[PDB]
């Protein structure tokens with residue numbers, strides 16, 4: 001049929017969905033930015049819903065982003081959160097899908113295995129749900145049916161949610177890979193790809209999964225598909241990712257991009273191995289007892305030992321490791337956001353692809369051997385809006401990383417221990 005004409009409204013539905021500065025651009029032929037949602041005939045379903053959704057003027061991001069996207073041009077955008085980046089890609093993407101129609105491929109087959117027209121990859125359940133909920137707002141009265149899947153939840157209901165129809169898919173990388181291997185999702189006709197919060201997805205170690213999804217499967221190559229990345233920070237691993245996934249794109253930054261962090265306090269202390277346990281105890285005693293704490297250690301043997309130690313000195317802690325049985329799983333995780341056990345001891349490898357959310361204090365009991373992993377770990381601080389904290393224990397075992405750590409601290413505008421320079 002037709003995908004520009006709105007469907008009959010449902011009043012049951014609207015009450016559900018609808019509860020009441022410099023900018024830099026870098027690249028060829030970047031189409032001029034925009035006044036108001038009115039320039040570019042998005043189409044009725046969009047502004048129909050735009051007025052429903054309280055949006056009055058697009059956001060600074062939404063405004064350099066939405067036209068670039070509508071003009072079939074890849075982009076790499078940097079913006080702090082609360083900047084309205086979600087609607088920035090959802091609005092124009094969905095607008096196109098409404099105008100162009102499902103597409104001859106899908107049509108030619110109109111259950112079970114689904115082929116999404118658009119794939120949005122998100123780091124966490126919380127953000128994935130967020131994107132999903134606004135997708136519903138802007139797909140209301142359309143024949144586009146969005147879905148969301150994520151880890152740390154029953155896959156059975158998700159699978160069945162998929163089989164009801166899925167044109168726009170929001171997903172955490174680990175769960176999407178699970179769906180593909182199960183034959184539930186195919187990317188053969190995916191025409192729009194979005195990596196929201198890319199830097200964080202890399203911090204949690206989703207890169208192998210993301211490269212499985214994009215590069216190693218049936219997903220249309222760049223130039224054919226339209227690809228968009230949104231990232232707070234812009235590390236080198238991220239510009240390499242943009243190099244590999246994007247095609248002659250436009251670069252956007254509203255506030256100027258910090259290389260990393262900006263909402264984490266960073267504190268390095270010299271602590272001999274002999275003293276780490278006592279030092280940790282002091283750190284924890286100063287913790288706002290409700291605040292969640294993540295403790296990284298090097299080996300599993302070390303993770304079980306420390307956690308054992310903490311539990312007997314009477315702390316509510318849990319461990320995630322791999323001498324551990326696989327479904328103690330989220331049980332450890334699930335106790336973490338519960339506040340039942342505000343201290344989680346873990347190895348970096350055992351925390352790969354785990355949505356360890358709302359962590360206020362990250363403690364590197366042991367430091368990794370490269371600065372890139374160090375960036376990954378302190379990346380587990382939670383919210384944007386609220387300053388987070390990263391304390392690292394350092395000694396002679398960590399000599400190799402002084403200069404990298406020193407440069408990072410300087411570029412992050414953090415206090416530099418006066419002995420650290422002397423070590424380099």
Ligand SMILES: Nc1ncnc2c1ncn2[C@@H]1O[C@H](COP(=O)(O)OP(=O)(O)NP(=O)(O)O)[C@@H](O)[C@H]1O
Pocket residue numbers: 054055056057058059062080081082083084085086087127130134197
């Ligand atoms: N043009 C707009 N006018 C008013 N409010 C808006 C506009 N665009 C988005 N918002 C609201 O701003 C809030 C935060 O923006 P959102 O759509 O979540 O993107 P975002 O916050 O930049 N991405 P993230 O920070 O990771 O959550 C939401 O409640 C949106 O409904």
